[PDB]
Structure formats: structure tokens, C-alpha cells
Design an enzyme around this catalytic site. Structure first.
Site, short mmCIF file in Angstrom:
data_model
loop_
_atom_site.label_atom_id
_atom_site.label_comp_id
_atom_site.label_asym_id
_atom_site.label_seq_id
_atom_site.Cartn_x
_atom_site.Cartn_y
_atom_site.Cartn_z
N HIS A 1 -73.10 25.08 -60.26
CA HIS A 1 -73.04 24.57 -61.90
C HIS A 1 -72.60 23.78 -62.17
CE1 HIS A 1 -76.84 26.97 -63.03
NE2 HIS A 1 -77.44 26.00 -63.20
N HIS B 1 -73.65 19.27 -59.11
CA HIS B 1 -74.82 18.76 -59.46
C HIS B 1 -75.13 18.49 -60.85
CE1 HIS B 1 -77.96 21.43 -61.51
NE2 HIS B 1 -77.66 21.80 -62.64
N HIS C 1 -75.42 17.44 -69.03
CA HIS C 1 -76.39 18.53 -69.02
C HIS C 1 -75.94 20.33 -68.95
CE1 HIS C 1 -77.29 18.90 -65.01
NE2 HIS C 1 -78.09 20.40 -65.12
N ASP C 2 -75.20 20.00 -68.38
CA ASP C 2 -74.18 21.31 -67.76
C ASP C 2 -73.07 21.56 -68.72
OD1 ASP C 2 -76.53 24.01 -67.17
OD2 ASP C 2 -76.52 22.45 -65.69
N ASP D 1 -83.18 18.93 -62.34
CA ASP D 1 -82.62 20.08 -62.78
C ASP D 1 -82.87 21.17 -61.72
OD1 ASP D 1 -80.22 21.63 -63.85
OD2 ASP D 1 -81.80 22.56 -65.26
N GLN E 1 -87.24 33.52 -52.66
CA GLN E 1 -87.15 31.30 -52.55
C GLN E 1 -88.88 31.54 -52.75
OE1 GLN E 1 -85.04 28.82 -52.81
NE2 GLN E 1 -84.23 30.88 -53.40
C1 LIG Z 1 -82.99 26.98 -55.75
N1 LIG Z 1 -83.21 26.58 -56.68
N2 LIG Z 1 -82.75 25.54 -58.04
C2 LIG Z 1 -82.86 25.62 -59.00
C3 LIG Z 1 -82.83 26.94 -59.37
C4 LIG Z 1 -83.00 27.79 -60.77
N3 LIG Z 1 -81.80 27.64 -61.44
O1 LIG Z 1 -83.17 28.30 -60.82
C5 LIG Z 1 -83.19 28.23 -57.67
C6 LIG Z 1 -83.72 28.90 -57.19
O2 LIG Z 1 -83.54 29.16 -56.09
N4 LIG Z 1 -83.48 29.86 -59.06
C7 LIG Z 1 -84.52 31.04 -57.78
C8 LIG Z 1 -85.46 31.70 -59.14
C9 LIG Z 1 -85.81 32.85 -58.85
C10 LIG Z 1 -85.52 33.67 -57.81
N5 LIG Z 1 -85.56 34.73 -57.40
C11 LIG Z 1 -84.86 35.12 -56.24
C12 LIG Z 1 -85.36 36.50 -55.64
C13 LIG Z 1 -86.44 37.23 -56.16
C14 LIG Z 1 -86.55 38.39 -55.47
C15 LIG Z 1 -85.25 38.66 -54.60
C16 LIG Z 1 -84.72 38.02 -54.23
CL1 LIG Z 1 -83.34 38.66 -53.53
C17 LIG Z 1 -84.66 37.21 -55.19
N6 LIG Z 1 -84.53 34.00 -56.09
C18 LIG Z 1 -84.45 33.17 -57.14
C19 LIG Z 1 -83.81 31.61 -57.22
MG LIG Z 2 -78.42 24.23 -67.74
ZN LIG Z 3 -78.17 22.18 -63.78
#
Ligand SMILES: Cn1ncc(C(N)=O)c1C(=O)Nc1ccc2[nH]c(-c3cccc(Cl)c3)nc2c1
Ligand SMILES: [Mg+2]
Ligand SMILES: [Zn+2]
Length: 316
Positions: free
Chosen positions: A68, A72, A106-107, A217, A269
């Protein structure tokens, strides 16, 4: 106004692509931002000297956190540029002006912690702003910076235009609170499927701009694979530092924030592409068909995460 901003040949071409990466040279990002403003808005939207002073005060109030950060801000602004340039008949003078600025700002002053960590920590920002806590702090930092001497980039707007463009910026920044995205996207999906969506309705425009902000975002998921994979390392660097802080308060972190759950990132992911990203870019593509290459590169990176799950690819 005989000073045009110019980019090297490769950047001038590739900056028109949705999947453009702004590169590792920090001292080029202000130039890239100004160029995108001159082309999407116009050379006379802002006085160059105030814009430059504004940009450098904004950069100064971003922190040296893994994700952040200042890079970004500019990345999210570039995704808004691509959306604006490929849809130029749909937006007002004031929307062009306000939206690239809202993306850069925005951040502002992000420390790398979620709204939930501020509630559990009992941070003073959580007493001041009970929901969209960080996002109300980012807007408030945007206003502070606009009120520095020689920093009113909107000096030529009337009192009531200044008030609208600040309201565009306030709403756009609040919309980057992902807890609000789910509601906003549900509403836009129904409005589009029943044919009630009306871009002449301000409350509908607000919703479309919000989704545009969510799209911008999350735009890491819409870059070429090596950019997408490398950026996921910085995102998790923050999530895991926050989960560490959650453990220090004697609270179990949710799995994405636990560094012990590292081997489940590929499956995380996939969860996030299916529940958040694909829906996000699907809905935005229905509303703004020319935003197609975002959804397409999202679907491509989904396959990449699926290859990682089946051991046909690695991610360290
Ligand atoms: C790529 N990207 N770009 C922006 C954002 C954002 N602002 O959220 C993200 C992102 O990666 N978010 C994200 C959300 C939920 C997740 N849940 C798990 C997750 C679940 C269960 C076990 C594990 Cl080990 C991990 N990883 C996540 C990543
Ligand atoms: Mg933000
Ligand atoms: Zn952001």
C-alpha cells in the site's frame, strides 16, 4: 502551455495497454502521472507548477510499506487512465479531473493494516470513523494536502464545482473499502439485468465509479503473470505482518493473514479470483464493454493459479 510531457517510445505505446507495469524507476512515476492527466483531461485542466507540488506532497504522505505504497497509488491511477481513455464519450470534465486524483490519493498514509486490525487494536481512527475507517482517513489526508499553500490544483473551479469534484473524490475513495464492493456489485448486477441502469442518474453514476475504483484497486490480478505473481508477494508481506499483530493481541488471525498458512496461498488466490475478481471484471465489462482486456487477463491469471495448485508451476 507549450510544455508537452513525452515518454520514451516503448512507454508511449505500452501505457495505452491495460496490463502496463509502471516500472521500478520511482523518479519517472510523477512524469507518467502528469502525462496521463494531460491526455485523459487536457494540458489546461491544471497549472503544472501546482500539480507538481501536489504530486510531491502526496508522494511524501505515502509510507514505505510493502504493498500500500506510492507505486500502488500510481498503478491504480494508470488503470483508471486506461478505463477513461477507452470510454472517453461517457465521463464529464469534472469526472476526468477528480478520478485520476482520487486514485493517486486513495491510500494516503496507509500503515499496512486493515480496518479490522484498527478496531481490534482500538486505534483512535476507529473512534473517529466507525466504518470505512482507513478510507475516511485517506480522504481527510487528501483535503489536508489540497489546503497546503500553492497546492489548490482546483483553484479555477467555481465554489460549487470545487464542491462536486471533492464529492466525486470522497465517494471514489470510500468505494475502495472492499467490504462495500459486495453490495455495490450486487446492486449494479440487478440494475443491468433488469435494464434499469441509467448513467444520467447520479446515484447510478456513483455506483459505476465505485466499481471502476474496485477494478482499479485490484488491477494486480489483470497484469501479465510475472507482474501478478511478484505483486502477490508484497500483498502477503503486509497480510502476514498484520496477522503477527493480531497474534500479539491474543486474537487468531483469519487464514490469509497467517504466515504459517503460506502453502495454501494458491488455493486462497483461487477463492479470491472466484468470489471477488472475476465477478468484479465481469460486471464492469457488461457496463463498459471496452474494459474487456481486464476480465480476459483476470481469467488468464486464474488458469495460472490452477496450474500452481496442480504442481505444473511454482510460486516462492
Ligand atoms: C491479489 N489481490 N489484489 C488485491 C487484493 C486485496 N486487496 O484483497 C488481493 C488479494 O490477493 N486478496 C486476497 C483476498 C482474500 C484472500 N484469501 C486468501 C487465503 C485464504 C485461505 C488461505 C490462505 Cl493461505 C489465503 N488469500 C487472499 C488474498
Ligand atoms: Mg485502500
Ligand atoms: Zn488501494
Amino acid at each position: 502551455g507549450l510544455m508537452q510531457f513525452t515518454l520514451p517510445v516503448r512507454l508511449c505505446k505500452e501505457i495505452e495497454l491495460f496490463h502496463f507495469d509502471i516500472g521500478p524507476f520511482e523518479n519517472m512515476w510523477p512524469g507518467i502521472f502528469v502525462y496521463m492527466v494531460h491526455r485523459s483531461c487536457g494540458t489546461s485542466c491544471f497549472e503544472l507548477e501546482k500539480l507538481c507540488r501536489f504530486i510531491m506532497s502526496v508522494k511524501k504522505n505515502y509510507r514505505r510499506v510493502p504493498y500500500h505504497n506510492w507505486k500502488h497509488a500510481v498503478t491504480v491511477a494508470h488503470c483508471m487512465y486506461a478505463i477513461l481513455q477507452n470510454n472517453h464519450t461517457l465521463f464529464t470534465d469534472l469526472e476526468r479531473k477528480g478520478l485520476l486524483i482520487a486514485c493517486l490519493c486513495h491510500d494516503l498514509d496507509h500503515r499496512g493494516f486493515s480496518n479490522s486490525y484498527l478496531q481490534k487494536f482500538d486505534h483512535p481512527l476507529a473512534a473517529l470513523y466507525s466504518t470505512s475507517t482507513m478510507e475516511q482517513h485517506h480522504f481527510s489526508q487528501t483535503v489536508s494536502i489540497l489546503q497546503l499553500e500553492g497546492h489548490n490544483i482546483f483553484s479555477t473551479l467555481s465554489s460549487s464545482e470545487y464542491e462536486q469534484v471533492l464529492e466525486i473524490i470522497r465517494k471514489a475513495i470510500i468505494a475502495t473499502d472492499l467490504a462495500l464492493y459486495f453490495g455495490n456489485r450486487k446492486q449494479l448486477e440487478e440494475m443491468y439485468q433488469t435494464g434499469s441502469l441509467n448513467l444520467n442518474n447520479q446515484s447510478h453514476r456513483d455506483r459505476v465509479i465505485g466499481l471502476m475504483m474496485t477494478a482499479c484497486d485490484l488491477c494486480s490480478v489483470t497484469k501479465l503473470w510475472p507482474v501478478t505473481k511478484l505483486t502477490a508477494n508484497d500483498i502477503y508481506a503486509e497480510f502476514w505482518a498484520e496477522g503477527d499483530e493480531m497474534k500479539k493481541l491474543g486474537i487468531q488471525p483469519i487464514p490469509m493473514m497467517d504466515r504459517d498458512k503460506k502453502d495454501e496461498v494458491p488455493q486462497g488466490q483461487l477463492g479470491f479470483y472466484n468470489a471477488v475478481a472475476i465477478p468484479c471484471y465481469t460486471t464492469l465489462t457488461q457496463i463498459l464493454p471496452p474494459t474487456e482486456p481486464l476480465l480476459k487477463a483476470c481469467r488468464d491469471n486464474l488458469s495460472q493459479w490452477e496450474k500452481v495448485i496442480r504442481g505444473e508451476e511454482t510460486a516462492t
